[PDB]
Amino acid sequence: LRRLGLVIPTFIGITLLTFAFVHMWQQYLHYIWGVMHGDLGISMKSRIPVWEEFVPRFQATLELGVCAMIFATAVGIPVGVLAAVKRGSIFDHTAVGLALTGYSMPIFWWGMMLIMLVSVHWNLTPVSGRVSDMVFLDDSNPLTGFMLIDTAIWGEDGNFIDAVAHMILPAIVLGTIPLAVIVRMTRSSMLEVLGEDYIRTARAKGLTRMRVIIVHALRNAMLPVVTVIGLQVGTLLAGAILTETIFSWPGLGRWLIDALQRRDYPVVQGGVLLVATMIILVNLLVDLLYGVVNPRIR
Amino acid sequence: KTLVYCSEGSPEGFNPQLFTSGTTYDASSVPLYNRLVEFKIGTTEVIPGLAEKWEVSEDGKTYTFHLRKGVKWHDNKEFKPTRELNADDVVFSFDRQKNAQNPYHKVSGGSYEYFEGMGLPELISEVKKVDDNTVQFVLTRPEAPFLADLAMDFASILSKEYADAMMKAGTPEKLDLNPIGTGPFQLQQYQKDSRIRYKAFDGYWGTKPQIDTLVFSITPDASVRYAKLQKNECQVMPYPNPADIARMKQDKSINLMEMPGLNVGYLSYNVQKKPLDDVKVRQALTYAVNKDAIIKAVYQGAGVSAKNLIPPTMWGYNDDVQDYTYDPEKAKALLKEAGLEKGFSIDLWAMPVQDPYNPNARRMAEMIQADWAKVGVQAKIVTYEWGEYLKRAKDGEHQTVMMGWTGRNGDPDNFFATLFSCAASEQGSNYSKWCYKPFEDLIQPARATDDHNKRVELYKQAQVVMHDQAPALIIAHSTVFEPVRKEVKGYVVDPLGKHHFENVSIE
Amino acid sequence: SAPVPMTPLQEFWHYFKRNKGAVVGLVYVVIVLFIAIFANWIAPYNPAEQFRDALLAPPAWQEGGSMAHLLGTDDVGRDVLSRLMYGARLSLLVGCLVVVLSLIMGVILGLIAGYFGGLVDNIIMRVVDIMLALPSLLLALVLVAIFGPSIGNAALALTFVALPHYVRLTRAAVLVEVNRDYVTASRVAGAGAMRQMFINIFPNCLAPLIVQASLGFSNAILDMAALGFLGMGAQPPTPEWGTMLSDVLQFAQSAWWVVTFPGLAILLTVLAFNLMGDGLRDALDPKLK
Amino acid sequence: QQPLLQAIDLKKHYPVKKGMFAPERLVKALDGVSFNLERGKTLAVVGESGCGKSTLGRLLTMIEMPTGGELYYQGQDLLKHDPQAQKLRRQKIQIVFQNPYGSLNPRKKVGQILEEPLLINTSLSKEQRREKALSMMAKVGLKTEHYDRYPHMFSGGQRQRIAIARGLMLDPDVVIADQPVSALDVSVRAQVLNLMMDLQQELGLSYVFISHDLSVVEHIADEVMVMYLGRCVEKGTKDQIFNNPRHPYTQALLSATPRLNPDDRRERIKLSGELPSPLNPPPGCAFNARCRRRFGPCTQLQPQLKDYGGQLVACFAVDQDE
Amino acid sequence: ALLNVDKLSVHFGDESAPFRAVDRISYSVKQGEVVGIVGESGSGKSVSSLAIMGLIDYPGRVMAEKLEFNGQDLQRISEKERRNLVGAEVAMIFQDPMTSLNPCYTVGFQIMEAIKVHQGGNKSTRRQRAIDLLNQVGIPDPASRLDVYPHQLSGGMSQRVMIAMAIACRPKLLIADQPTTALDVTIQAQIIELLLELQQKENMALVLITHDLALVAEAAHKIIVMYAGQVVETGDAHAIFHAPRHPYTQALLRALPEFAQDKERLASLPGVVPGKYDRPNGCLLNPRCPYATDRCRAEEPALNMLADGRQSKCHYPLDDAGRP
Ligand SMILES: Nc1ncnc2c1ncn2[C@@H]1O[C@H](COP(=O)(O)OP(=O)(O)OP(O)(O)=S)[C@@H](O)[C@H]1O
Ligand SMILES: Nc1ncnc2c1ncn2[C@@H]1O[C@H](COP(=O)(O)OP(=O)(O)OP(O)(O)=S)[C@@H](O)[C@H]1O
């Protein structure tokens, strides 16, 4: 398997923990067989196999989770750098202040604020769901289940536009929690770096200040910053329950807590093991990236 | 021509026999299927469904239904319907529920929670085919509501021809996962927890729906449903915020439909618990609560203060009973005489609820906590998660519990029998754990009687016996606010809590 | 002449003061705590009293307001001001507990995983990726079974959910520090492992942990507001800013006060821990000394 | 009796990967050095800048274990990990680092740095260790003020003296000094070397004194060892190796030393031709590409350490001549 | 002049009791002129160079009466322009090469940045010119050592690598803060001959800082002696070491290994550099000088200029034979 070690102790580990947890006995032994043969059982509400029930929505939570990080990073890092280059300035207090105002409102209230301001009052963006309700895909096509890819290849007469305009408020509400972390961590780390001797050498060589920032300082600040990216992708897949409820997203957070309220033991035993597997792949990629940013730890 | 309806939550599946949640019946039964009998929209009157004409034996044990001619099924992609509606479909639709030998009974998780608890496997002694066009039910004992029980959404007529086609093709789960019925809107797609797409049934026997297609846009937050409704993203919406009612009344392009609901909220006493096994105590805690404040501070004017268990627009309503009106010094006089002036501690379990038009039970529980504290009896609000709440409630662990209930079959036995009788007490639907013989002798004969003018009097007596004993503090009757865009025409509200799109059109 | 020697705490303080915003944030947190421990002398009413004459009474400074209810009234009719001054009592507790516990356990396991080797690193990373997979709510529901209805069933859930961050960030520093030459010199001196971790390496690891600690206090509250959208972690008559804000969401467009004020109680506490963490950072940075 | 310190064909090879995905190279960093060291002696180690000297220092101090070879202290194996014994042996061998700023922990006052060895290894109390630290600091000409300073608040010649102070604190048997005086002004270089000699004569310390300045090892050495491309090329008393350098590399080495005296200056014996690559060492003798005495055998076989009356030499011309 | 320093002073610590790490130094450097700086470790040689570069941060502060480079004034010209000026025309070797280099790039990128910035070549020229430079500097294997990280170099390779990229700068003025310290003699001679070749070919100026005198005796034109923060002596290179005017240079030269037999205890000047808390008034050398009169104790000597063109900060300059 594509895992560096502890392979069967991991598969047994997340299963016995989740089994134990959700049943709050030989059923454990029986269930392990089934998933080891290659299927995670049948759901108790929808009465369909767990993998056919997991795939269509795991492609809903990744499509938003990645779209939130692209936002969280494209904004988080540049801001987080400037916040350090201009320590104590207006910019410093403004930028980081707004970051923490966006954080300080729990997801319900400020999600409804963006709806009422941007969607209801200003008339800029559609309110909720993946595509406008009265536009549907022809199922005959070999569609993957990522609405952006599906509408990009097979949609008609501006349907891709709609499929993205429905993403941007969900993205902003989810990605503002990571955004806070990014900004605080980028600024924090960068400060620690800007005083070091090799940055003083970079001044002496006659480089432009932007090059000293983005080439010399930034690469030495990136280890805590990629560490928080990896930690936040873990919660954006497993969690997200409250952005999924407000924006009517057909995600995995709803499905997994709803399954636990109906006591569908198969979907809880299965979806949590699966999510563990996908978190390990992201952890091992960021742990591989540590040695790409810093040669001395390879 | 199209509608978008902004549904409260995703349906548990697409055959109503297997399920209890109201949103599942609004997705799976109102658009999709038809029934032997049905309630006429805007009433609880029973009228001809799939049966043109029906007959009743003088002894009340045998019912005969003369099925319609020409009733057709929808063109599923898995299957072409070869045949019209025949008795052979109806006798299947209850043999799937009555006895274990049927080859579909345990397909797709044959739990039948709505049927097994209703007593229809005890009351239906047999179902018999008369001919290709006639069905009969023979019942063990006479029950007056049975005609309305065949009208409610758990009964539905399912194709034996489609069932046998999918069974011979080795995949019988497609009977319930891929629905075929006789109803006005039949299924096209179901995006999981996102959308449900229906198409107007071309061949429908009744009034052809004026909309060509209907879409459900599942949106579990009320405030977002209203946010959708402002900019035409829905055209119809369920169960509004009590908060928003003012704005909604004031809005220029929403016709706020309004009706007195068949929904009763109450707090029920365990009469078997040591502070509540004396009736005096139960009277005091009823004099202690200001119902007239709760209809402002929980319902914002969306509630009528309740004298008795029945909704006030119903037949058999006893208007002559007094109410135990807000009077702390009487509540103290009762606890004094009782010897409980020293006070006591009570648990009060709030409740998360799956059906629409439930009250905000957290707000009621903390209000009632203050109201009893001001008469010398403090309370602790408990909010165990629904599965643990139900587990501990069947255990009898509680002293008092919040509940709401709705008029499911349109007749008072949905309240007195289903919610306060001894027959509901071992099932756990009657949370009061009470059985005052004199009530049973007024509910059991009232179900086994022909004359409505005698049923009315026995129910008028049942309300008086209930008022003397106080098995629950009966609080307020919700008014069902049901917003509809000003462009929508022909919508009529259902007192039962169901959304009937068959007759709508959009301007 | 040579000045009087300064104790490490005195030195810390002296370099702490040079940051003005850090002093402002400290001063703010210290009065928010002073309010909390004395709200039963300071606050104008018992927050269990419903004033039913004044349902949704706006603040004093708006039409229909009265000076009795300075902040106005909630929809059930209780005084908002008393509900915030009492709500600090459990909110601060939750936050402090969560943060402290989580931080502690994360520093220890993340130092062990970063310093000792690779087998222990793979075990602790297996544990951490398992921990990120279990939802917070799930944990809560579990704990309900473990224990009776208690604030602990929340606290312990929050702790766990938060713990993978403090474990993994500590390791991300210790991997850069352990192969720098001062660790080598310490080793050659005769320093044992535990010392190398908690005295020689750990002071260099504080850069990111301050950040994650200062956001932890906000999380501790926002998570309890998510738990309080469901039936979890609190009971109605005892206020808590997360529960209080999540119990009033339906009014946010009709009654601004009730929703906004608790939002300020969270926000001014988040901004205070941000400014306090910037000073604590600067209080440890040697290049500023 | 077994020598205080003994090395037998010590080898250390470093893996070099062009990237995260790339073919692996192997840098030839130490190719089997051998020597004996005794109580009170200095072994000076001299030769090219980039020829194995700090690598040899990191083996000898147990900073790294070698890729083959053996290493013995008082007849006790160093490489065979004995956790129980390591406690005792650890202190007895010490390091002074090259470019020692990186060896000082940025977030601890130099007083703590100096106290740490005594804290770990001795029973001296909080103020007694302060006293000790001050004492030591004063021996190298470090002021009392510095006790409260941080490592970034110094110059190179103070950082080196800080590092010397830390190494010489414990009363070690062996000090492996990687360029201990390379950033000191002469007026204090004399004070540090006088401390190292006072210690050597008082306690019986031994030094592996790595240097580039030959003037210093002409004074501080009993024995001198010459290294080129990870291999020994000459060994013997500094009297022998200054008076009669036989190996062709040592002649070109000692005949480029600066001198202040105008009349002691000589035009240097220049070297030309491609520097051997420590990745792809040339066949046989390392110095053949630059050497002026090159025969045929030079590009075919490698010279081992032959003896000529105590001056060990690794060359073929020398053999030819003997 | 290409560099002029009327007065310069750098303080560290707060204003109530400042450490006077550089104290009213003054010197000039002509184009094509080599100036040696020598004297006790702690006397302000690196700080004096860093302050010209403008590389002094918060905890310290720069005082100067006038400070000029190439016809522009580093206090009247703005930061945005004075940084461009000094960085473009001045380059510095730093004292520790291991921490001066960036730990997260390959040596080829590290050098090929400077070559791109200061000479504008294409990608294939930048490769070849880093090979050429590392070659000429004396690198064992240029083709392979470009791909090596600064922690895989050892000290005396990292030092040659930064001498290499500093020469790539094409400076008008190079400050060599100890360019020979971790280098063997046989290579020391290659470095110094390279620098002096540059100095001749390109009219390049050179400020060379050393703790070892013979290198600057041969190489330098002019020598500045710094002690305790201030210039104690100045003059011609050759002259200085033959005939010292200041008691400090006499006590600096008399300590060298050339003046003792093998394993004798070497001579030195006793005591320690002044602190901030024990700094004596008048001549700072007072506590250590053997010729200290009461005028030395009472009054700080001026930077007196002798008739032989030299300068010494002393009340009684030494004769050609060893006495005031
Ligand atoms: N970690 C490493 N990875 C790769 N090569 C290394 C590493 N450490 C040292 N080297 C190589 O080891 C060889 C010898 O290095 P050292 O022994 O440290 O140098 P040295 O002979 O003491 O030279 P100095 O530092 O200039 S006096 C050189 O070819 C180095 O490039
Ligand atoms: N940041 C600082 N804060 C306080 N004192 C400092 C600081 N930087 C340097 N010093 C002091 O200034 C003097 C060192 O100045 P440098 O110019 O670095 O010394 P130097 O003459 O170059 O000595 P070298 O490098 O050893 S040859 C010493 O007295 C130090 O104690």
Ligand code: SF4
């Ligand atoms: S063996 Fe040959 S090549 Fe090597 S040093 Fe001796 S003469 Fe030169």
Ligand code: SF4
């Ligand atoms: S002024 Fe006096 S003490 Fe100072 S250097 Fe001259 S002779 Fe010595």
